[PDB]
Amino acid sequence: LLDSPIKVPLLLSEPINIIDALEMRDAVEKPQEFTIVAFVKYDKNQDV
């Protein structure tokens, strides 16, 4: 259920699916990898 194709909603019709293009066979015991990384720093000049 968590292996749904996540994509930007631009086109309604998809001739080829994400899983169909990725050619992976997924079952109920396949852990799907997810990693998100967001890095932010507000750099200031030390020379006041």
């Binding site: 998809e14 080829i16 899983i19």
Partner: protein, 144 residues
Amino acid sequence: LSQVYSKVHNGSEILFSYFQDLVITLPFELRKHKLIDVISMYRELLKDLSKEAQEVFKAIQSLKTTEVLRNLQDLLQFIFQLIEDNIKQLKEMKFTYLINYIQDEINTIFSDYIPYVFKLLKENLCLNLHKFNEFIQNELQEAS
């Protein structure tokens, strides 16, 4: 109707083929067979609906009035025969006898059972009096 139904059936077949193509390309646990069965049953239901719809459309427009009139005549004759049979049944089993039977029964009851009712009342009165005497004697002995 045949042309319209053929066009609609072809469109539905194209839509079902596209949906099945989408389904196969996507992973599923065991529901692909269920979806195929649903599509097949829906196609069969569509065919049955088309076949019944063409017949009912050809029938409503006053195009097969002869069959309707003949069936109505047959049904009316059937109802007439049933009514005649019921009239014969009612004529067979009359009701004048049961009035005399119940008259005799109530005469017998009023003439005989009323003294029996009084005798039952007197016997129950004696039994209750004896029970009360026994109970009060027991209570007096217990208090003593």
